Symmetry: D2
Subunit: 87 residues, 4 copies
């Protein structure tokens, strides 16, 4: 499960936060990235939560950004990787 969204609704030229929420199961060699116009963003902060009861994990990758008319943002998940754009 992958959900991509901005902390606040977007005004171009106003600093904001982009978020990728990811959920899954078991032990797993999964990796996550935020993209700007198709290239990986570096120093992306995350939040990792896991529960032994059901081998479940919950990940939120987030970054400061200033949304612009030009720029295209996405979130990508590999180990094949699945890309979810923001809108």
């Amino acid at each position: 499960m992958i959900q991509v969204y901005s902390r606040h609704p977007a005004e171009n030229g106003k600093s904001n936060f982009l978020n990728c929420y990811v959920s899954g199961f078991h032990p797993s060699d999964i990796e996550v990235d935020l993209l700007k116009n198709g290239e990986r963003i570096e120093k992306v902060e995350h939040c990792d939560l896991s529960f032994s009861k059901d081998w479940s994990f919950y990940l939120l990758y987030y970054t400061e950004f200033t949304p612009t008319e030009k720029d295209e943002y996405a979130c990508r998940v590999n180990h094949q990787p699945k890309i979810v754009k923001w809108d």
Copy 2:
């Protein structure tokens, strides 16, 4: 940081939950256990939370138990291990 407590206040003979909350920093090869009269309890459930922003982790180890007059419970943390009794 280690905090040991029962979900509900204890009536002997009533099923309850014992909890060990542990907090720390950085990457780390730390391990955690709940003890009954000094021996490790098996199949103990946990909750692991970590944040990249400050290399911080937060762990809650919990188990069903029926508190008794006889039995002594603790939480132990190694990698030396530090033992915190419940009361």
Copy 3:
């Protein structure tokens, strides 16, 4: 946002959990309900997280259910913001 989903993938006849995740700003007059064929379910528990700094809130409304082909499940959210309460169907 509002997201409706089953804990595990859905097999008709098999016990599962239905979840309504709702996130926003100014909890305020926020009400959330899970419906089965338009009627409120009484098994419904929830998990409320809120932060004072920015009046941000995160809600999970959940219940045990046994999904069937005939049955329709939905989540209902009403807020000062919305002209009319919002219904989000599942699958």
Copy 4:
């Protein structure tokens, strides 16, 4: 429970965070405040987590502070349960 602690170990003169963690049952008339020398701090934000299933609640009240030897910091909790409001000092 009530636990008062600094985010990082305390160096006099150095910016830090003070935290008051409060957990219980029936949030109800729960009020929580951080004091500096007996006076409420206005920088105070909080993080509220609650579950309907068992009326269980987990609160973190926090603020930026610069600890000094002279200054006394505390957390104050009042509840229907308590005869009188409880003050827990830090360190």
